[PDB]
Design a protein around this ligand. Structure first.
Ligand code: MG
Ligand code: MG
Ligand code: MG
Ligand code: MG
Ligand code: MG
Ligand code: MG
Ligand code: MG
Ligand code: MG
Ligand code: MG
Ligand code: MG
Ligand code: MG
Ligand code: MG
Ligand code: MG
Ligand code: MG
Ligand code: MG
Ligand code: MG
Ligand code: MG
Ligand code: MG
Ligand code: MG
Ligand code: MG
Ligand code: MG
Ligand code: MG
Ligand code: MG
Ligand code: MG
Ligand code: MG
Ligand code: MG
Ligand code: MG
Ligand code: MG
Ligand code: MG
Ligand code: MG
Ligand code: MG
Ligand code: MG
Ligand code: MG
Ligand code: MG
Ligand code: MG
Ligand code: MG
Ligand code: MG
Ligand code: MG
Ligand code: MG
Ligand code: MG
Ligand code: MG
Ligand code: MG
Ligand code: MG
Ligand code: MG
Ligand code: MG
Ligand code: MG
Ligand code: MG
Ligand code: MG
Ligand code: MG
Ligand code: MG
Ligand code: MG
Ligand code: MG
Ligand code: MG
Ligand code: MG
Ligand code: MG
Ligand code: MG
Ligand code: MG
Ligand code: MG
Ligand code: MG
Ligand code: MG
Ligand code: MG
Ligand code: MG
Ligand code: MG
Ligand code: MG
Ligand code: MG
Ligand code: MG
Ligand code: MG
Ligand code: MG
Ligand code: MG
Ligand code: MG
Ligand code: MG
Ligand code: MG
Ligand code: MG
Ligand code: MG
Ligand code: MG
Ligand code: MG
Ligand code: MG
Ligand code: MG
Ligand code: MG
Ligand code: MG
Ligand code: MG
Ligand code: MG
Ligand code: MG
Ligand code: MG
Ligand code: MG
Ligand code: MG
Ligand code: MG
Ligand code: MG
Ligand code: MG
Ligand code: MG
Ligand code: MG
Ligand code: MG
Ligand code: MG
Ligand code: MG
Ligand code: MG
Ligand code: MG
Ligand code: MG
Ligand code: MG
Ligand code: MG
Ligand code: MG
Ligand code: MG
Ligand code: MG
Ligand code: MG
Ligand code: MG
Ligand code: MG
Ligand code: MG
Ligand code: MG
Ligand code: MG
Ligand code: MG
Ligand code: MG
Ligand code: MG
Ligand code: MG
Ligand code: MG
Ligand code: MG
Ligand code: MG
Ligand code: MG
Ligand code: MG
Ligand code: MG
Ligand code: MG
Ligand code: MG
Ligand code: MG
Ligand code: MG
Ligand code: MG
Ligand code: MG
Ligand code: MG
Ligand code: MG
Ligand code: MG
Ligand code: MG
Ligand code: MG
Ligand code: MG
Length: 252
RNA sequence: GUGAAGCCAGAGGAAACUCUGGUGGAGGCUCGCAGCGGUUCUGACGUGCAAAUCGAUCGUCAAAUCUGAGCAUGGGGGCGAA
RNA sequence: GUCCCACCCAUACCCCGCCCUCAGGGUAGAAACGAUGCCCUGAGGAGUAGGCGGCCGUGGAGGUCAGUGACGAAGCCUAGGGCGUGAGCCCGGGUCGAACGGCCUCUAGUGCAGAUCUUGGUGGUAGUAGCAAAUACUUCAAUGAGAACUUGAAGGACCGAAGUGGGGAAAGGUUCCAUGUGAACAGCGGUUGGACAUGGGUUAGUCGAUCCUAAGCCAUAGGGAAGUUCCGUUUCAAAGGGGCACUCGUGCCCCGUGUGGCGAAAGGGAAGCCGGUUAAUAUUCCGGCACCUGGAUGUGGGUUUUGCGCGGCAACGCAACUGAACGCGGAGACGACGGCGGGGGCCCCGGGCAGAGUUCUCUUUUCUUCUUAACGGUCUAUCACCCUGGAAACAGUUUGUCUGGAGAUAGGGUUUAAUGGCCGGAAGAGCCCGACACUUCUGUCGGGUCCGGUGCGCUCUCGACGUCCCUUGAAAAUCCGCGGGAGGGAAUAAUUCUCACGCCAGGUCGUACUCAUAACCGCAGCAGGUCCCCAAGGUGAACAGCCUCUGGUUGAUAGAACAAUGUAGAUAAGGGAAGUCGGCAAAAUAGAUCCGUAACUUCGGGAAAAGGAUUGGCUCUAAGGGUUGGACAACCAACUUAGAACUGGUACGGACAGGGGGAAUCUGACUGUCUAAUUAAAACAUAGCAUUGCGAUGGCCAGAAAGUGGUGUUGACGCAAUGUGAUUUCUGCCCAGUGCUCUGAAUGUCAAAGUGAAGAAAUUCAACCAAGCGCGGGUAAACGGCGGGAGUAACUAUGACUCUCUUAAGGUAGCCAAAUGCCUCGUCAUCUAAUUAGUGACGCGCAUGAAUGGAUUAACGAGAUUCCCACUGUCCCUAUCUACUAUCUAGCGAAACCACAGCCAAGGGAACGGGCUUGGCAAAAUCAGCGGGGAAAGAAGACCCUGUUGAGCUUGACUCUAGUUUGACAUUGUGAAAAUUUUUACUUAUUCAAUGAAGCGGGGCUGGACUUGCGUCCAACUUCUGGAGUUAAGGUCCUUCGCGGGCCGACCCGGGUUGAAGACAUUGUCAGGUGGGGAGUUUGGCUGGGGCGGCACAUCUGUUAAACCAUAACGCAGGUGUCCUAAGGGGGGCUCAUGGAGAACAGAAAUCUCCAGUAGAACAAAAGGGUAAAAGUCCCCUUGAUUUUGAUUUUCAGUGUGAAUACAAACCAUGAAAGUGUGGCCUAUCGAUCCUUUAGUCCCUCGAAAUUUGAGGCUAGAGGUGCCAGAAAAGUUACCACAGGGAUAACUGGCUUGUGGCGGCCAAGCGUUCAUAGCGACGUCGCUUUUUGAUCCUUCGAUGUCGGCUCUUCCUAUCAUACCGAAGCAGAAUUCGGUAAGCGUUGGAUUGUUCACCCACUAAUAGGGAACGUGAGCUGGGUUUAGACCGUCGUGAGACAGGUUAGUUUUACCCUACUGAUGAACUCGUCGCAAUGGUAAUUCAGCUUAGUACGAGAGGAACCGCUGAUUCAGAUAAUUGGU
């Protein structure tokens, strides 16, 4: 048989993400002395649209504590942020929307965005439009913080991890139907070469495990073991259950 | 060609929102020329003009439209709206 | 039919000659002899495969012939000889020119008709096919040997601004220009040429490259890799650039986070325009007039002298008008589309000027020219911004919008923005006229070169608005501004000047030409393909079609004629789909304006639904604008609309251009995409829906590895993997099976490592185990599944209901003879005259059914289907016209194919002959057609089978494997605690993350707030504002007294950059599991083709089997893979099955008695033999079913194996013995090598020598190969491949004729009566090859496989027609039969049909053959490769003799045959004859006979005669119609 499309995707080549129109990655400031001990003030210059990203980004200018230059950063814009707004990043920053604070100096029950998995990593969690991370609780003796992720998972991160107060802008982007093949094409044409998608059962046996046959049918259980070989993992990988979800799920 | 929002005016009514002239210029809308394609004649030709062309008739024609150059993917590999 | 006589001839027989072979003899005191010779005698002679012998020929070697030869070697040619059976040898003649041969040995690349053989050459075909797309040529002249395709002039035409025009990019490379030209090429010619030959031609600071970066590529540091090299592109790197100072280069002082290259002739980007000029270059040359960049220093100007301009309220202005580091900003720099406004150019209109055209007539006419570059100066030009002021009675305002107390209207200003006006350039140019010189050298000189208008016009550009996006639409080099304020700046002298003028320089490569019906790629001068720019007039909505201007061509082999058949363009009376699988093809409709427009609907559509009317020309009228005066008048300007009269051909979108429509069904929602070159679809995609995994120490994936990579400039509204497939309404039940997921205990299973025991040790044995699995839960929008039987309602049918068997559950809602149902052309209704079609219903549905999605569905569809209107040559039924061919000619000129060839009939034959046999026959040489034959040409059949030949794909095939999971060992160190194992502590190994490696850890100074034995905790100064923040101010001492030098300002200390994980993870090596993701391989045989079946595959009995033996078939009836401690061995006593008599229960049968009883019983098992004091049966004793090795028999090769037979060595059993016993009374009951396991002994070996373990040998058994002389082995292919096979299937033919069809003989019986008018049982004899079987003879290096259409001929077993005979024949109508194939045998609905059945006509609507006639005749509806859907089946790939949809139909010019047409020879003609060949007519109706014969009556013929008509044939065009 052939190498299947899912296997080919990992080679790169035509499946590499598009990057020309992306200006800079969305990252916090590097964790420095000012952010560790007090706060630093930055000015929002513009709210820009980043192709391939649903959420808008905010360009924020800060002063260098050690040089005469000025530094422009690219944050994920939280909804409610505006051009000409002062934002504050640090331990002693006020608890207002757009401020970047360590989770230790944040009370329980507030939502943040671009939460660092570890301090200094400049943001990893809850960075997509309409998404946020909730600060469930604190453990000061352990120096840790329990948070709730957009997926519903519970995580524990060091209290020094930073986050931006508020909710990622971009609202309910997925609330309107795409309604058109062209609109799906435009959505993915700035992300990746993954659209359109041909069904495996419409292929031939040389091309996919779902293969051919005189009727379009999978012919064997579509749930595939977690430890199946590469080239076998087509369908529902390591599926605990299948079928329509007809009630609440114990797992979360 | 059709004529979506938005806008102007006038008629009713009590209200609220009904109606009627206009304006406007949206749509993977439509007729249709070039381009692109290739349905039927199962036409021509079938030691051809041609190792796939020719004619008529057809599909689409403002956007999943057509196309140049540069560049990338190399054989059990690639690429594939398959 | 029989008998007799003579005769004819085979390669046979007889006699003779000769050849050869074989056989038998003779031949030496050698006068003897290729002694391998000779002489004598007898017999014999076929031959594929094959064997042997002898000889001939070729290249080369040794010896020899004292060989041949320029007075002619070799070779070659030869209707000239000789020899040999023959292969061959020799000679004569000719040609020719330098070597060669005989004999004996030696040697080999040694002998050709084949191999779809190799290379080369050459034929018939054949002067043949053909040289026919792109509208088209003609006259005169010149040139020349020669002119349709050279040139000039004239005419006629085309391209018709998305050109046949003018220039470019790629690509070519000299094709560009001049001159000359024999051949070759330009498929005709050629004087011509992109050809050939000889010479020329490409000029840049300004146009490009060069410079920049993009996607991307390659280095570097490092890390992998055995390595070629891979990653890496800033990453675990000590990676650079700025200034000052001496006689002299070298003395220092500051900044630093960066620290490569390549990559665009369309992206970014410094700068050039006009006129002229050459044969060919020009934005490059020449003339004039400019610009940019860089470098230098001047003159003037400006500014200042303790300093770096002035003005304006302001927006800002002015000719400058200092400014380091460091920083900020702008430009470069960006999407698509819409309407509006400005500008350039083009187009158009009016007037004037100059020229030209027309001018019978008319036309103040028609056409052309009338131009102004870069670069500058100057004045303007929307948006915006500034000042005054303060708006509701809101106002301003666009086509649209919008704007305003965050300050509108208004008034006044500032400013970005020329492709605008004027001026310089610049009229001196260019152009246009006009007039005077002249072999040329020289032209010369005059004049003129203007003014207005218009616009939904075209094109480009600019501007302000606006729309769309889950889409927001490059980078860098370079240039500029500013914030900052470092340095520096002569009251009589320079002046860190972006001002004016001035000086110097600008290298290198490209530059011709074409860019295409001839310069590129398609083998080529190819109707194909190949990226752009400019873009006139008319009609018209219009870069539509059609015509024209500029410009370009007139180039595609020509002449003549007008047959068939064609290709292309059309027209047809009447009918109007009757054609056909099917309306294929064609026709019909078509623009605009005005009316009118249904069902349904997602309310958007449907819709141009359906349909109807009008349209020309001319003469008028009205309306729709701008400007000025004074509510009218005047002036200016286009078009768009409406109304009226008149008028003609009742015509007018007059050409061109240009929708047919409707009622429904299946299906996919739609737009979109694909099998380039047979499938455009219902397939794919899609939005929507649903499921699954993943929180980064991660999911999925790539890599040999990596300090590797993609997703990822990413973080659940995300990434990845699947299914279904818009909307609407729904999506039922089943977790038993296979998967996936979760737990691994009360539970079982296990490897390596480790633990314990035994041992001398190797080892062996025990426990223990991680993963995985057994186990137990979950899960179907996972793969998938979703049942049988029996009764039941006052007649009855059915079964609401019930009784019963089983599953994991038993098909729910829906839907249906549907693209899914076989039976089936289902049943009913409708549609038609007629419907296997369509639609609507019905449903025990072979085999419908719910995201393997069910049902419905507006809109959409080059999808499939039915009907209706319109329309028509599809047809009845054909006809006609045009162009180009074909045709004939000149020139040029192939190919396929070809054993030899070409008339038939029958026969036989390899079962379909051109050749053979027997007949018919049979006359040169030819031309146009033609599609019967050549089982015509393609192409070593693709269907089928075989091969111990493959390949693609699948899986629970066999064997493995990347990856992965888990365990162990190592990396791997240091502590503590718990009674060796577990837990948690350390950081330095190791791993991760961040950063420009800035503020980490301890303190102590201060600020605080909390507390009473004054003690502890916290903190380090930024949060009103879209400003700024840098090159330190100061304190303190030193000082050269300086924005100078140190310590503070800015606390000290540890040099751990910071934060995490941490001896875990990672990594290396082994071990268990998982692993169609991947690899390799396999997937029996026989066989009335193969498959399925069966086993005729090892083996036994009887028979087939034809009396020894032997002997076949998928022949017949059967049997075997066991069973027995006795059912083996010995001995003895007895006699069985059965019958007749008898005896209580007792009988048909229980036991007892007697008599008969040849085996009719029994002997393990099939069958056949055999057995009676036994071989049966019972009793007694036993283990001969033992040890050893030979011999023999059957199957047979006289090999194994299995069986079997007689005897020897022994020592046993039994009988008093004799004797018997080496398994089963006989004929079947079974198994090699290798390996393993036993048994056997003072047995042999472990090879330096010993002992003990262990191992290996020798002899005899066992573990098994049943495909049984003995491989370890699953499918599929419709995507398929190869070597073959007519050894072997599907279609023709051949034999046969069961079966099918058609007859005969007999005649029980039927027929009221009567077997035989006519039927006809039981039986029996046949014929036919239009059925289907059976066979496998021909064809698998191919004979084109159904049907229909068309066309001819043949048969008779006669449907009709002619003439006859019989009846249960009064007439009429029928029935049966005879002679009879002359002549006919139809039009339609449904179906691909064949077949069939209906409607209807008819005299009748008979049956058949001709390779199941007929595909180089058609067509392609059926069968039907590859695409696709459904149902059932399969785990799957896939299958289906099931349904459905789409799917390339090639070649004739040869020979013959046929149809026609010429024709030599016999002088040429005219008029004739007639051998032979062909042959043609057919049926019905009406009137009369006649309401008559005959009949009770109903009813109801016929002969003759008359008049028409059907089908067919041969002509013809007066008339009518078509063209
Ligand atoms: Mg592969
Ligand atoms: Mg798909
Ligand atoms: Mg497919
Ligand atoms: Mg597969
Ligand atoms: Mg699978
Ligand atoms: Mg499907
Ligand atoms: Mg469209
Ligand atoms: Mg085309
Ligand atoms: Mg064709
Ligand atoms: Mg036509
Ligand atoms: Mg012989
Ligand atoms: Mg030789
Ligand atoms: Mg000679
Ligand atoms: Mg010589
Ligand atoms: Mg040879
Ligand atoms: Mg030869
Ligand atoms: Mg031969
Ligand atoms: Mg010819
Ligand atoms: Mg031709
Ligand atoms: Mg011609
Ligand atoms: Mg032509
Ligand atoms: Mg002459
Ligand atoms: Mg010509
Ligand atoms: Mg023309
Ligand atoms: Mg154009
Ligand atoms: Mg040209
Ligand atoms: Mg051109
Ligand atoms: Mg190129
Ligand atoms: Mg010449
Ligand atoms: Mg020629
Ligand atoms: Mg010539
Ligand atoms: Mg010539
Ligand atoms: Mg000449
Ligand atoms: Mg340039
Ligand atoms: Mg350069
Ligand atoms: Mg590299
Ligand atoms: Mg290295
Ligand atoms: Mg470069
Ligand atoms: Mg450029
Ligand atoms: Mg010059
Ligand atoms: Mg001065
Ligand atoms: Mg650009
Ligand atoms: Mg015009
Ligand atoms: Mg001028
Ligand atoms: Mg001037
Ligand atoms: Mg003048
Ligand atoms: Mg072309
Ligand atoms: Mg026009
Ligand atoms: Mg017009
Ligand atoms: Mg030309
Ligand atoms: Mg030609
Ligand atoms: Mg007609
Ligand atoms: Mg007519
Ligand atoms: Mg009609
Ligand atoms: Mg048609
Ligand atoms: Mg038509
Ligand atoms: Mg409507
Ligand atoms: Mg309709
Ligand atoms: Mg209409
Ligand atoms: Mg049309
Ligand atoms: Mg579709
Ligand atoms: Mg595509
Ligand atoms: Mg195709
Ligand atoms: Mg193909
Ligand atoms: Mg699913
Ligand atoms: Mg299950
Ligand atoms: Mg279960
Ligand atoms: Mg376990
Ligand atoms: Mg049901
Ligand atoms: Mg349906
Ligand atoms: Mg049904
Ligand atoms: Mg039906
Ligand atoms: Mg029907
Ligand atoms: Mg079913
Ligand atoms: Mg089903
Ligand atoms: Mg379901
Ligand atoms: Mg519909
Ligand atoms: Mg011909
Ligand atoms: Mg000729
Ligand atoms: Mg010959
Ligand atoms: Mg014959
Ligand atoms: Mg014959
Ligand atoms: Mg022959
Ligand atoms: Mg002849
Ligand atoms: Mg022909
Ligand atoms: Mg023929
Ligand atoms: Mg032949
Ligand atoms: Mg073959
Ligand atoms: Mg074999
Ligand atoms: Mg194979
Ligand atoms: Mg293959
Ligand atoms: Mg104090
Ligand atoms: Mg730690
Ligand atoms: Mg470890
Ligand atoms: Mg596998
Ligand atoms: Mg495999
Ligand atoms: Mg076989
Ligand atoms: Mg079988
Ligand atoms: Mg015998
Ligand atoms: Mg048998
Ligand atoms: Mg016995
Ligand atoms: Mg015994
Ligand atoms: Mg006895
Ligand atoms: Mg004894
Ligand atoms: Mg054995
Ligand atoms: Mg063995
Ligand atoms: Mg030894
Ligand atoms: Mg064995
Ligand atoms: Mg055998
Ligand atoms: Mg045969
Ligand atoms: Mg018969
Ligand atoms: Mg009879
Ligand atoms: Mg037969
Ligand atoms: Mg046969
Ligand atoms: Mg064959
Ligand atoms: Mg043949
Ligand atoms: Mg043939
Ligand atoms: Mg027919
Ligand atoms: Mg007869
Ligand atoms: Mg008769
Ligand atoms: Mg006849
Ligand atoms: Mg026949
Ligand atoms: Mg036939
Ligand atoms: Mg034929
Ligand atoms: Mg054919
Ligand atoms: Mg046929
Ligand atoms: Mg089928
Ligand atoms: Mg079909
Ligand atoms: Mg088709
Ligand atoms: Mg009478």
């Amino acid at each position: 048989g052939r190498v299947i499309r899912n296997q080919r995707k990992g080679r790169g080549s035509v499946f590499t993400a598009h990057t020309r129109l992306r200006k800079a990655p969305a990252k916090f400031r590097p964790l420095d002395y000012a952010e560790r001990h007090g706060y630093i003030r930055g000015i929002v210059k513009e709210i820009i649209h980043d192709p391939g990203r649903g959420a808008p980004l905010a360009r924020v200018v800060f002063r260098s504590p050690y040089k005469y230059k000025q530094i422009t950063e690219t944050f994920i814009a939280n909804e409610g942020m505006y051009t000409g707004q002062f934002i504050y990043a640090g331990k002693n920053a006020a608890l207002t929307v757009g401020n970047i604070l360590p989770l230790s100096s944040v009370p329980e029950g507030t939502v943040v965005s671009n939460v660092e998995e570890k301090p200094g990593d400049r943001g990893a969690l809850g960075r997509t439009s309409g998404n946020y991370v909730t600060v469930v609780g604190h453990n000061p003796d352990e120096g840790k913080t329990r948070i709730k992720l957009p997926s519903g998972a519970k995580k524990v991160v060091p209290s020094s991890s930073r986050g931006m107060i508020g909710i990622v802008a971009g609202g309910g982007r997925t609330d309107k139907p795409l309604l058109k093949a062209s609109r799906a094409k435009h959505k993915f044409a700035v992300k990746r070469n993954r659209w359109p998608k041909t069904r495996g059962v419409a292929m031939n046996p040389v091309d996919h495990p779902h293969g051919g046959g005189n009727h379009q049918h999978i012919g064997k259980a579509s749930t595939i073991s977690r430890y199946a070989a590469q080239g076998q993992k087509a369908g529902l990988i390591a599926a605990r259950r299948t079928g329509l979800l007809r009630g609440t799920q114990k797992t979360k």
